[PDB]
Amino acid sequence: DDEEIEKGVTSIVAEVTELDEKEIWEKRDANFFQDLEIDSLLALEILALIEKKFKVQIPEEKLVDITSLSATIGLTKSVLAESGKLEHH
């Protein structure tokens, strides 16, 4: 589910980053690194929490490209479509 995925990924990134869900969403196209924090440890943690929410295996080596909220959402959608679990409109 499109809404469900975009909101779930937002919540996870908000947690890991200790930022507010509305701000992270407003900054959905910001670069994850430098432009506000998020390093390889935080990206690693984002990946792991997504691989718990949605029950989804993500070979854990994209973090270099877990690079914005919208990129991260897109990654989650791709992986959900691989798994036969995406309803996309």
Please give the annotated binding residues for Zn(2+), written as ranges: 6, 18, 20, 29, 39, 51
Residue type, position 27, single letter? K
Residue 87 binding Zn ion, by CB under 5 A: no
Residues 45, 48, 54, 57: what is their CA dihedral angle, to the nearest 10 degrees? 150
Residue 57 binding Zn ion, by CB under 5 A: yes
Which 3 state secondary structure label does DSSP give 57? coil
Residue 67 binding Zn ion, by CB under 5 A: no
Residues 12, 13, 17, 18: what is their CA dihedral angle, to the nearest 10 degrees? -50
Site for Zn ion in 23-42 (CB under 5 A): 29, 39, 41
Interacting residues with Zn ion (CB under 5 A): 6, 18, 20, 29, 39, 41, 57, 70
